[PDB]
Design a binder for this molecule. Structure first.
Ligand SMILES: COc1cccc(OC)c1-c1cc(C(=O)N[C@]2(C(=O)O)[C@@H]3C[C@H]4C[C@H](C[C@@H]2C4)C3)nn1-c1ccnc2cc(Cl)ccc12
Length: 441
């Protein structure tokens, strides 16, 4: 009896947040206009999946909560509500299945037949086609009007178990399993081709669409499998009989919980990957040298102080690749000049390494740590003397570089200069050293 309240509270909560959630999602994707066509066509399929979820929450859930609340009470929705409850529930399972299949085809064609896709696909055609999806869904659901009926009050099948075993089997085959098999094959083949095509506005959309499709396909199996499993049992199939009763109950809730959380989830997940893509784009743009792309991303709201798995900020990559323009703009939008990575390298280490003179100047001008030492004990002057960048050694020494600094290997930059046959560079450190001796006295 106590559980009834607990289930009610949970079931009511799922209803209000589920209806409003899917409603907001429906109204949002409606207003939403994207320049990339596929972005739109993806959102059309995401609309009809939110509609399918909303219908089930408005029409089906309330009937269940009554069936749960009033156990073994008369069916109080008439023969119309009886036949209709299963029509809508069957009409939505088809709609969802045809959407995830239609979406996966459009996204397969995009990647694997682009110059066949360009000549076939359009926002208008997708919109007109998603109508056909809901028609087919309604026509495929018509048989459930005749299978279910009212008797003595129970909304129970009004047809033989033989004829009923057929429809349940035909339902589960192409409202599930067929879509699952088609979605996973097409999305796999496409995703493999996509990761190869990497090894532009349209190309961005594809990576988004493939993520979306893998997210909805995983969300589709977790929700509808225990349900369709439960259905499949009726067709084929004690003390555990009462224990297998819990599965039936658990499978219903799952369809509802999923349908209610998916909007709250998708939006939560979209935000994270939305920024994760911006940050990933900035790092690529910085290292590549697309000074244009960087400008756009920083305005968009990309994190100036992003990092790699290694701990390479954009300023590390720009300084390393020697993109003075990108270095200048990164510092302009408040990049950490003294930022460290795993090995403990600052940008000034990398600009002294590759030997970009003016970047070394800019980093120091914007307050770079001149003596900054890494894990191995190495400093920027070690690296300039190592590669023999005489001009960089000059400015480093000029900006208060420690000519004496030794590493873990017990080698100073003076030694490294000699050890690389850099006769000129070595001569400058000797001069610099004896000057430091005289001020020390
Ligand atoms: C022989 O059936 C099973 C055997 C083993 C496990 C089962 O479910 C966990 C089932 C099963 C499936 C359905 C099952 O899927 N009913 C429906 C439903 O979804 O509500 C009903 C009946 C038809 C038309 C329509 C849609 C389908 C199939 C309404 N109902 N159902 C059950 C039938 C009879 N007694 C059961 C007792 C227990 Cl403890 C659990 C399940 C039972």
């Amino acid at each position: 009896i106590y559980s009834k309240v607990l289930v009610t509270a949970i079931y009511l909560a799922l209803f209000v947040v589920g209806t409003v959630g899917n409603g907001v999602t429906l109204f949002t994707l409606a207003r939403k206009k994207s320049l990339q066509s596929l972005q739109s066509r993806v959102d059309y399929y995401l609309g009809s999946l939110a509609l399918s979820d909303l219908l089930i929450l408005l029409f089906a859930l309330p009937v269940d909560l009554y069936n749960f609340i009033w156990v073994h009470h008369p069916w109080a929705f008439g023969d119309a509500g009886c036949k209709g409850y299963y029509f809508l529930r069957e009409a939505c399972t088809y709609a969802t299945a045809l959407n995830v299949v239609s979406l996966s085809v459009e996204l397969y064609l995009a990647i694997c037949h682009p110059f066949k896709a360009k000549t076939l696909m359009s926002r208008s055609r997708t919109k007109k086609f998603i109508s056909a999806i809901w028609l087919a869904s309604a026509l495929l659901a018509i048989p459930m009007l005749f299978t279910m009926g009212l008797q003595n009050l129970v909304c129970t099948p009004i047809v033989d178990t033989a004829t009923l075993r057929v429809v349940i089997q035909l339902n589960t085959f192409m409202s599930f399993l067929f879509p699952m098999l088609v979605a996973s094959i097409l999305n796999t083949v496409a995703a493999r081709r996509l990761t190869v095509m990497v090894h532009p506005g349209r190309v961005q959309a594809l990576r988004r669409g493939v993520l979306v499709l893998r997210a909805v396909v995983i969300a589709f199996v977790v929700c509808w499998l225990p349900y369709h499993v439960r259905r499949l049992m009726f067709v084929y199939i004690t003390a555990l009989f009462d224990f297998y009763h819990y599965f039936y109950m658990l499978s219903n809730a799952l369809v509802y919980v999923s349908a209610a959380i998916n909007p709250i989830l998708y939006n939560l997940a979209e935000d994270l990957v939305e920024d994760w893509e911006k940050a990933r784009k900035l790092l690529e743009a910085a290292r590549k040298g697309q000074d244009d792309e960087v400008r756009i991303l920083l305005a968009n709201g990309a994190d100036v102080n992003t990092a790699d798995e290694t701990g390479f900020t954009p300023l590390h990559l720009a300084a390393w690749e020697g993109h003075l323009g990108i270095v200048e703009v990164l510092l302009k939008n408040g990049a950490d000049v003294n930022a460290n990575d795993e090995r403990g390298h600052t940008p000034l280490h990398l600009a002294a390494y590759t030997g970009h003179l003016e970047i070394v100047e800019v980093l120091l001008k914007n307050g770079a740590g001149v003596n900054a030492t890494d894990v191995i004990g190495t400093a920027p002057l070690h690296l300039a003397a190592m590669w023999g960048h005489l001009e960089i050694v000059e400015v480093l020494l000029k900006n208060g570089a420690d000519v004496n600094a030794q590493d873990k290997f017990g080698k100073t930059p003076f030694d490294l200069a000699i050890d690389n046959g850099n006769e000129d560079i070595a001569e400058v450190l000797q001069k610099a050293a004896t000057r430091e001796l005289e001020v020390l006295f």
